[PDB]
Amino acid sequence: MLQDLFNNYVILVGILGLIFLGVNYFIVESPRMDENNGNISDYIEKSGPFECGFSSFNPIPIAFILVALLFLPFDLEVSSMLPYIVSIYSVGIYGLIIFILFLLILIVGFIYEFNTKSLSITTILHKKNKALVKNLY
Amino acid sequence: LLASGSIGVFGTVIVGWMSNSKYTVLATVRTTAQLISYELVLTTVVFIIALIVSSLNINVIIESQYNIWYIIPFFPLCLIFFISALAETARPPFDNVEAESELVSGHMTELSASPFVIFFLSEYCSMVLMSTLTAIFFFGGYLPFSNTIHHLILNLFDQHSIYYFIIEGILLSGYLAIKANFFMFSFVWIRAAAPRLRYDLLILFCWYVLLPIVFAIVVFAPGILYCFDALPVII
Amino acid sequence: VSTFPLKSDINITKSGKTLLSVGQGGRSSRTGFTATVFGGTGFLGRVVVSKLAKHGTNVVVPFRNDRARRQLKVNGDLGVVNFVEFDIRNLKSIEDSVKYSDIVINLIGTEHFSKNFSIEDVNIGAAERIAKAAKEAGVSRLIHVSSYNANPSSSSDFYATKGIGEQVVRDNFGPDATIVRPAPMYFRNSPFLNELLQIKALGGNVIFKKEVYPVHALQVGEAIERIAFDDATAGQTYELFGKERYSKKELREMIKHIIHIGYYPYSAGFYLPAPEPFLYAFALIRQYISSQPRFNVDQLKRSHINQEIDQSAKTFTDLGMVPDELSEYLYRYVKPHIQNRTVYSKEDIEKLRDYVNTP
Amino acid sequence: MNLEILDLSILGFYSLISSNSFESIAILVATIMPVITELWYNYSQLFALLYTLIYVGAVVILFVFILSVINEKESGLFILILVLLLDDLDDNESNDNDYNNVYITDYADWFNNYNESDLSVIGNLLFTEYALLLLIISFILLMSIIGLILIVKKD
Amino acid sequence: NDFYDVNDFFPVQVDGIESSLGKYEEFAKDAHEWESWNLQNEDHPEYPVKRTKIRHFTLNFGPQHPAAHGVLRLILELHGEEILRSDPHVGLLHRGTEKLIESKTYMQALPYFDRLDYVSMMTNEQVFSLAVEKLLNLEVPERGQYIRTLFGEITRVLNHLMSVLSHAMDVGALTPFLWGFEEREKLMEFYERVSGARLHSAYVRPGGVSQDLPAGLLDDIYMWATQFGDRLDETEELLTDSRIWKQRTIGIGEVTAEDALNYGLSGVMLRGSGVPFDIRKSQPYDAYDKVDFDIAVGTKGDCYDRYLIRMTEFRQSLRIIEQCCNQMPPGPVKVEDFKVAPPPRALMKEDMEALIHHFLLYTKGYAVPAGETYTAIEAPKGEMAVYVVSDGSERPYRCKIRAPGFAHLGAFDHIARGHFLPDAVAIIGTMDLVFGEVDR
Amino acid sequence: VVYNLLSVRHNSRIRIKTYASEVSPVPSVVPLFQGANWFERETYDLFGIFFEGHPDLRRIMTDYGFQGHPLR
Amino acid sequence: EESSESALSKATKWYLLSEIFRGLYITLEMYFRAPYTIYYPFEKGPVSPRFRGEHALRRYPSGEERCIACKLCEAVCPAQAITIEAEERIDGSRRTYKYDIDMTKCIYCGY
Amino acid sequence: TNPTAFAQTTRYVKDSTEMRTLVLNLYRRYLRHSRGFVNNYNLDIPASQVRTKIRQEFERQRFVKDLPLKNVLYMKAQMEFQELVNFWKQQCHVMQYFESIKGDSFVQKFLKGAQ
């Protein structure tokens, strides 16, 4: 299988990257031509954040962290299913039973993280209600 | 194809991660997990189709659908593929990254001129690509809607002249284009009909609903194929 | 600024015009005058137009760059700042820029030349034609602006044309034409403080040995205000500059610490030393390849000339204004290019001067 | 002009000068890409794509995910080029000169009429011959799922 | 303090630290280098750690935001994503209408009310008319009251089309916005056909309405009314039963009945909490006592309940609008009292006393007997009321305007406590914050 | 100073009038009615009335550092 | 235990997105309808005789100005957009010699 | 509902001595945040002058005798602090606060219109 046609494509796309950047740099009118008030550098008002107009100045939930952390074990489970795809016929029943076992052990992990509700954001800080109880004497 | 897409995911989260704007840097932690979470679902669906043909070649998958289109046996995977495809391109209703009402332009609230176009062009190259990929995996790719109409049209040209091969190439890409257009239509169509989905309920959707189903099928399709002695081989 | 730009509410010009001011000097007030700032879309014009329109003096601003003049109007009330399209190769337009005016200011000038104008046509031809037309239009006062080393005998083209430009004004308008020769003016977005902050300064050692005196652009703008509104300044020449002597090599390094920019300044290209015969060659090429005003050959000769003070002319003490030192104003004009924020007072800046020269 | 050398010299230049964690994560991506590209050509196209799918797609974007969580706060040109040049001189990883100067070939044969990809053979052996290695791996993955939750989960 | 800040176990007495080569004090001057000799544990709850008081991440949901449908500066103090404290900074649209009304007669002060709630224009000027007519001891004739009910409900439909559909747009549904805003174009045509302005129709005035209805207006309100029922269904198609819409609203912004009455929440953000109160019933005004219509009361006090109540108030408006089309009487549209209502132009140009009254009404104004009042109506947003103080003169002495949105926005902190940033967007939309009324 | 109270119970409205001078404070009803937090914040901004017992009294309508109380 | 729907019916609607596919279908009905857009400036939206727009001072058919400088409009004008200065004309008529409207101060109210 | 940062309850003091303790305490609070005022507001002057001008405004009211005047000047004293800390004022306002600036002879005022 030849890939010299593919190589020229990758090279052209690499050339297309330089063209997109520089075409802006050669077609925009000179700062003097428009208003001359300054370049992007000195014009710090124009080169700044957007805060809807008013100038101002990540303790993320642990549930978000466990979403990203648990992505890695579940990704290596999916990527290790790749060898079974292109060899499903020649491993027969034996490799099919092994594959199912390879999935059951990982599912017991899915059960564990489903019961603990690890991914739920939860609301421990707020949403409290109480019963007004009179304390007659 | 899956490796190349995951490089683009790395490209998306980098936009905000080099910025101090609060709106732009907001759409990194939520952007990162949304793409991370629905990448498992998109990767597994592609692997189930690859398991039915026992080939990781795009051309072999398309040709394997001659007698049947994988939308008929694997209709649920097509809904799961299309749902996942929306999230990966950050299209609505999975729009929470660049939500105008929530985080303005998202990462693009600090982008202007060329960096805006290049990033905007990327979102629409993915839309065209992921619409073409749904055509390839479930609607037969470049295969004709009718073999008879395909045969009748091509009999009007002589196979010994280059005019025959232009017509076939126009036809074969035409079938793909019509199938792909229907899904580029559905990208827009769902945007005009579904309100945006909340992010916290969005991460729990792919993990607590989609992933168990996708692993359930990946243990289901090998079972049905083995039961009838129909394990696939690359001819 | 303050609250009233005048010392009296009645001001009679050389031409018998009696101008009566109304109001307290704010936006809704008027002074009765009508100036004409040429090159008001330039760096110095914007400050000069702003001060005049701030106190209700009608200002005619001839322009050629349509977009660059839009921001001039915010300074004046309704009907105050007026716009006249013009070109110095057109006479009719200039004869309409000065038609109704009572003060004419000429800030047009260049240190670079272009494919359509040379330095000879701009510093000499334009100023002459303005003064000739401003005289025939019955204007009482003309104020002109030239360089800080106006000397018709200079080998540099900038001071060759700037020096001759002074003569052709008084030879056209007459012996009443005021003249202002400001030092290098520093301000926000100033051409002077720019090249000191520019990172990749090619030929830095060749360019930055030139010595000058800093001067506030606002004080130059306020000085021009006092000159126009005073009739005792007619025919007088002003040499506006600062007290303390600063060299660009000192500034380019004192600035360097405020910017806070080890390996990087050498790797980033902050220092780009160059043999002079190359600089004369590369700046030669960009005159006909670059479409933008680049650091050209004539500017190179100026780097061999320090600032000269023509001691026979006048200063700020004639105007009763204390010149402002770059010590107290350098910091606030580099904050755009700039834990706890590091703030430099007058003492902090002067101490920073000591460190640069200490080996 | 083996340009793969110039990519690493740039990479070796920025590894000596990186200060924050943004550049440190950049060295990771700037190292896998030469690893992937030099595997795509020459040795193994299958493991170039496995690296992209598993390293870039899975473990690299996790680094930038936690860097946004952790924090973002806070030499001389002669010594660097001197070190890089000194690092550049001696690049022979092995000292068997004949093994590095003499070329070899293989002879093909037609005895293998059942031609299938490497990933076919790897699956053939991993799911049959070394099914213990495969099963322990799912056991190591299982411990991580439990291990991540016990370390990080608060309550 | 401001800049920084600093047991479950037995207090254990350890005395006599000694090693094998000597005692602690014999090597205490070197133990600063030996880190296994640190007597200070880093896990003890009494460990002094001088940690700075880093402020919570404070996002500026500033005015330049599609959610801020006016000029709002919402300051959100949150732990992570769940919102701890929110500080709305209103006043960016404060124009001092209340100061300006005191310098203008009652007829000139009327247009200041169309500019409070931009979208409920005619109900704004209905509450100023009711208050002044109450002070004037005058009553609008029968036809005038039906017109103010007819355009009191056209205005209510106009408001909810703006409020419900822009609320959906923030949540994500872009299309239902567009469909409804063509109905707004069709309804604004009735505003312009009777008054001459699409938005700020100074139509309702103290004493009645400006002019009579043009011929054929009733036949256009009807022809629009026959079709409009299907326009609400196509809105309820995309939103009412959508699981994504119900995930964005059910359980979001819950308000108890005790909390609603305490914060003075009125209109729909009080019937969502289950209280069946409505000002068209408590103090019926301007022919609202003649027509028959129902009201809808929530039970969960969340955004989904208020969504349903508004969609019911659509269909109850379309039920009143038809009756006003059928029960419209003939007669004068304004008080037959030329000392408070300008005479017709034809009579002005022919009758001497009409010319005198036309003259004094447009220069001097009409005097209002001294006293004060507090007139409330059921505005589309909620309870809107004015406190007008008269002094026997032709200009109001005081006019306080009680805008429903202003009292709602105060309760935003009490409701948003314990919600995420995408949930704040829903709560603002469910409040209907047009900031002309908030910053009157 | 005028207060308007609503009784959803019996469908009634009552009005409380209480005077005040420029320097004499007035009790804050925020401990009773939470809805008066902003209505008292507005009255001070536009009348300068001292409200004793208000948890957070500040400008709500006028600009920050606005001198003088407009409705006087 | 009191839900009328069976478990399978509730899950078939849930897994197959019953109301969403309907929601798409209603949106697709609009695709085959006549849009509302008019092509301004080649067409104009409806106007009525009561419409308020630009101001104009009128005349009698004989040509004399209609305004007798009575200053009524100046006194009604809520925004004080009108400035009238008047005197007896050269021939004795009660006419105005100065009449301005600050069109940036008028609220287009029709008083 | 909860109050915002650096907020205080509004209580009408009835003792003169009690107020001065609050007045003196508040003064250091202004002084403590002076460097942050410069940093947050990007002021062009060192923090020394910021501490300088704070003190002057306290003295301006030092000699009030009647008590009811004392409270209101203290009630508004806290409010200006609270707005300054929380970055509620914009940079334009704070600059103009510290950017503020001998009378002319009778002839001079007469010459230019006087007042």
Ligand SMILES: CCCCCCCCCCCCCCCCCC(=O)OC[C@H](COP(=O)(O)OCCN)OC(=O)CCCCCCCCCCCCCCCCC
């Ligand atoms: C298609 C091209 C994509 C790359 C475009 C950028 C090219 C610039 C050169 C950087 C890449 C070289 C590879 C070595 C990594 C070096 C990263 C580094 O040290 O910082 C570079 C960048 C600019 O900062 P700089 O001034 O150079 O260094 C001092 C800044 N305090 O500091 C920054 O972090 C700014 C943002 C740069 C983010 C780049 C992310 C890492 C690169 C990944 C994409 C390319 C993958 C590597 C391919 C080449 C490998 C040799």
Ligand SMILES: NC(=O)C1=CN([C@@H]2O[C@H](COP(=O)(O)OP(=O)(O)OC[C@H]3O[C@@H](n4cnc5c(N)ncnc54)[C@H](OP(=O)(O)O)[C@@H]3O)[C@@H](O)[C@H]2O)C=CC1
């Ligand atoms: N630090 C400084 O800036 C110093 C400058 N000077 C001199 O002061 C004078 C004013 O320059 P400055 O305002 O500071 O900065 P600029 O150089 O930007 O001002 C040049 C002005 O002259 C106009 N000009 C140049 N050529 C033409 C032309 N053919 N036709 C019409 N107008 C033309 C320009 O109009 P346009 O903007 O539309 O191009 C511009 O308004 C200059 O002569 C300068 O040499 C002296 C000492 C210090």
Ligand SMILES: CCCCCCCCCCCC(=O)OC[C@H](COP(=O)(O)OCC[N+](C)(C)C)OC(=O)CCCCCCCCCCC
């Ligand atoms: C066939 C391939 C195309 C459609 C694929 C998706 C099928 C969705 C319906 C199954 C789920 C379900 O729950 O179905 C059942 C549901 C709900 O029934 P119910 O509310 O109990 O009915 C009430 C009681 N009756 C039964 C007496 C009436 O019906 C539907 O909502 C049907 C929706 C049809 C319109 C959407 C289809 C067109 C979409 C675009 C096609 C190009």
Ligand SMILES: CCCCCCCCCCCC(=O)OC[C@H](COP(=O)(O)OCC[N+](C)(C)C)OC(=O)CCCCCCCCCCC
């Ligand atoms: C066995 C057959 C397998 C079929 C596989 C298909 C499954 C698809 C998902 C069904 C589950 C579901 O819609 O779930 C809804 C989930 C989470 O809902 P929840 O948090 O659990 O609350 C509801 C359930 N309750 C009350 C029981 C707990 O969120 C959503 O609204 C996701 C909506 C995504 C719509 C994206 C647009 C569609 C584009 C494609 C068509 C053009």
Ligand code: SF4
């Ligand atoms: S002054 Fe005004 S109202 Fe009176 S006649 Fe003239 S235009 Fe008409």
Ligand code: SF4
């Ligand atoms: S329409 Fe304009 S000019 Fe006429 S009264 Fe109203 S605001 Fe004044």
